[PDB]
């Protein structure tokens, strides 16, 4: 508890990495009824929700994507290369997702790997796009 509080989690880029993150940070407000992504679109960047909820309508039907805790995207660790979309990403309610390409992600993690340790530790992708 002491180390978790004294450490710098993925609360949203803290003093240090925030400089690089905030730079490559691409905020996106997705209102209730707006489509963030659609089948066929390439996902060369992960999408992290700050607060709210989103629904991805897959060929068959919506899958399951919570709010912020429902982290998802195209992680370099899991996947080596990007890929097309499997379904249609439709926002559920007014939210604010952030898009970040693998390049930017690797950069921030390269300059400040210590953060990733806690970020990937406290944060865990809830949904994996493109398998």
């Amino acid at each position: 508890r002491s180390l978790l509080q004294h450490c710098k989690p993925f609360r949203g880029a803290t003093k240090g990495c925030l400089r690089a993150l905030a730079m490559k940070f691409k905020t996106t407000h997705a209102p209730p009824g707006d489509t963030l992504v659609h089948a066929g679109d390439l996902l060369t960047a992960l999408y992290f929700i700050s607060r709210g909820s989103i629904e991805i309508l897959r060929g068959d039907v919506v899958v399951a994507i919570l709010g912020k805790n429902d982290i998802f995207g195209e992680p370099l660790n899991l996947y080596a290369r990007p890929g097309k979309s499997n379904g249609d990403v439709r926002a559920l309610t007014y939210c604010d997702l952030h898009k970040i390409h693998r390049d930017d992600l690797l950069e921030v993690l390269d300059m400040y790997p210590e953060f990733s340790d806690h970020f990937w530790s406290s944060l865990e992708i809830t949904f994996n796009l493109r398998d």
Side-chain angles (χ1 to χ4, degrees), residues 39-123:
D41 202 85
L42 167 51
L43 316 157
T44 30
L46 28 143
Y47 255 78
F48 172 89
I49 299 152
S50 94
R51 173 148 100 167
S53 251
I54 187 141
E55 56 182 331
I56 291 173
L57 277 80
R58 126 185 246 192
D60 249 290
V61 91
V62 273
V63 263
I65 8 281
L66 308 325
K68 55 190 302 233
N69 241 285
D70 150 66
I71 158 171
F72 70 113
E74 253 307 278
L76 277 143
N77 218 100
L78 223 135
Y79 244 91
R81 264 100 175 288
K84 274 128 126 141
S85 36
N86 263 288
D88 322 317
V89 175
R90 202 98 186 201
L92 282 156
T93 186
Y94 205 74
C95 59
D96 214 350
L97 316 88
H98 299 83
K99 182 205 80 177
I100 152 153
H101 296 97
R102 47 124 259 173
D103 167 50
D104 315 322
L105 231 198
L106 181 277
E107 281 306 271
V108 180
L109 261 76
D110 190 291
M111 69 183 73
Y112 262 85
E114 169 130 75
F115 189 11
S116 5
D117 226 69
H118 229 255
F119 152 54
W120 285 92
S121 164
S122 210
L123 230 308

